[PDB]
Enzyme design. Sequence first.
Site, PDB file in Angstrom:
ATOM      1  N   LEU A  20      45.183  66.258  30.600  1.00 47.21           N
ATOM      2  CA  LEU A  20      46.390  66.973  30.217  1.00 47.21           C
ATOM      3  C   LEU A  20      47.139  66.246  29.115  1.00 47.21           C
ATOM      4  CD1 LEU A  20      47.828  68.177  33.623  1.00 47.21           C
ATOM      5  CD2 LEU A  20      46.702  69.493  31.806  1.00 47.21           C
ATOM      6  N   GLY A  21      47.115  64.924  29.166  1.00 45.94           N
ATOM      7  CA  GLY A  21      47.936  64.149  28.264  1.00 45.94           C
ATOM      8  C   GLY A  21      47.703  62.673  28.445  1.00 45.94           C
ATOM      9  N   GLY A  58      49.253  58.543  27.626  1.00 42.87           N
ATOM     10  CA  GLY A  58      50.342  57.637  27.311  1.00 42.87           C
ATOM     11  C   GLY A  58      49.792  56.225  27.246  1.00 42.87           C
ATOM     12  N   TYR A  65      50.386  53.550  29.160  1.00 43.60           N
ATOM     13  CA  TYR A  65      49.981  53.018  30.460  1.00 43.60           C
ATOM     14  C   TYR A  65      49.566  54.083  31.466  1.00 43.60           C
ATOM     15  CZ  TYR A  65      52.039  48.599  28.889  1.00 43.60           C
ATOM     16  OH  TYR A  65      52.329  47.450  28.194  1.00 43.60           O
ATOM     17  N   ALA A  66      49.104  55.235  30.992  1.00 44.30           N
ATOM     18  CA  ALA A  66      48.641  56.288  31.893  1.00 44.30           C
ATOM     19  C   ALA A  66      47.997  57.466  31.168  1.00 44.30           C
ATOM     20  CB  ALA A  66      49.779  56.776  32.787  1.00 44.30           C
ATOM     21  N   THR A  67      46.990  58.045  31.817  1.00 40.50           N
ATOM     22  CA  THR A  67      46.371  59.288  31.387  1.00 40.50           C
ATOM     23  C   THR A  67      46.593  60.292  32.507  1.00 40.50           C
ATOM     24  OG1 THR A  67      44.600  57.893  30.509  1.00 40.50           O
ATOM     25  CG2 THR A  67      44.255  60.291  30.440  1.00 40.50           C
ATOM     26  N   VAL A  68      47.104  61.465  32.162  1.00 43.08           N
ATOM     27  CA  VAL A  68      47.367  62.499  33.151  1.00 43.08           C
ATOM     28  C   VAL A  68      46.264  63.551  33.139  1.00 43.08           C
ATOM     29  CG1 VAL A  68      49.041  64.173  34.002  1.00 43.08           C
ATOM     30  CG2 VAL A  68      49.810  62.075  32.844  1.00 43.08           C
ATOM     31  N   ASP A  80      64.250  57.238  28.915  1.00 37.74           N
ATOM     32  CA  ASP A  80      63.246  57.796  28.011  1.00 37.74           C
ATOM     33  C   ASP A  80      63.278  59.306  28.009  1.00 37.74           C
ATOM     34  OD1 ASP A  80      61.348  57.622  25.990  1.00 37.74           O
ATOM     35  OD2 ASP A  80      59.648  57.518  27.364  1.00 37.74           O
TER      36      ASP A  80
END
Lengths: 294, 190
Positions: A12-13, A15, A17-20, A126
């Site tokens: 989906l997306g 970042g 420190y993360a992949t969704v 943020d």
Amino acid sequence: SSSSQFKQLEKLGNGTYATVYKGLNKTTGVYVALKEVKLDSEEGTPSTAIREISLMKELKHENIVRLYDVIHTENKLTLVFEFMDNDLKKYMDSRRGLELNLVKYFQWQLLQGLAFCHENKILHRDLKPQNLLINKRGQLKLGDFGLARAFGIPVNTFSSEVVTLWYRAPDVLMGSRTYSTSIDIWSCGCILAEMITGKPLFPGTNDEEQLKLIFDIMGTPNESLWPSVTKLPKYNPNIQQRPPRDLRQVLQPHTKEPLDGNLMDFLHGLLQLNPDMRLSAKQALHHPWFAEYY
Amino acid sequence: SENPLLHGIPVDVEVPHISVDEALANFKETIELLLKLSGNRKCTGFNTRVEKKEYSNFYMKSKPTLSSADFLKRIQDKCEYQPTVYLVATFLIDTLFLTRDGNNILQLKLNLQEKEVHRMIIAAVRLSTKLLEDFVHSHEYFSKVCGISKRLLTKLEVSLLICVCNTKLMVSNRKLAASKLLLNELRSFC
């Protein structure tokens, strides 16, 4: 909370420190969002994951994304969130300035969510359209509390480098290590403007250009209206003064929609240079622009 | 509803005017009392095997080079943290080992052993700094201070995190306060 409980679907997306990923609870058949955080044995657990997880049982609210579970597998923590169809940035990219009845409804929900955070003494730090999740029903929920921080608590360190640059407050850009709730309220003002016009209000490329763009529209800090400005490290009394611009004339060209006095008043309440003069989220919720909702 | 450990604590309670040395002492003494309580009880343990597996990471086969008190001195000498770090650290162990039943009576959730203490201190301090500070010591620096590998440090952070994330963890003045109030309550039974 077993790894096999959720089926992983399409990405989906992404970042830092993360992949969704989109996911599916295999038992209920209900969609979830799988936020996979890489765990590097030599680097340690990201602080963003730890902070987000620390809120998962307590910050429950209709306008805050729900975090259901945390799953540890080799080199990976998966945070299992409620699934949301879109985020503001993509909903708009999917079109760019929104009709005003939608703008008001999204702003209302953002401020409801935020008021609940501030009531709990948590700063988001943020807020930006990508971090505002939206579903089919038009529900908007604050997401990504990776940078969130409790205020009123004896700390040793401070990042004035929080908040995505475009949405970062001038007092912060000028080195303030003592902002509280005002930091998010500035971001809310920038989001409101961006919803109206379809464009980021202040698209800086670096710290200096960001302040320049802010002062161009809002005017230079006036030491009589903001005495405390002299306590900021990067404040420069020797810059040439500039008066504020007419906020409506700045925005109106970019939307076919009439920007009324109630709306423009509201916006001025959120975008004060002096952080002390910004509306609280609670005050903002009871501004006349939101009259109809009562 | 709040973390049951907070039942009775005023919502407007003030951040404790506590010193680093007292913060450190309350931390150590909480551990000592949990150890005491754990020798009387046979506890109901974890809700899952997941948590049991994470928790086993705390068991240290060999006796530590330094006592708990001296290890804590070494950490503070090297890191120079605010008292808030240890208050939060204390609450993390509080919420791992204690709850309250239906009648607001404190209950031990899990048994603490002496062989689990050294690694527990490492994890609670590290997690605490990450909950609190925008800047924390590097993973390399903290590992060396605690005399462990970076790989172990990561394993310990995550183990404690998994073990407590089913409880209410949000940093707040009342949790800071609770760290000392729970110690007083335990103190009063032992």
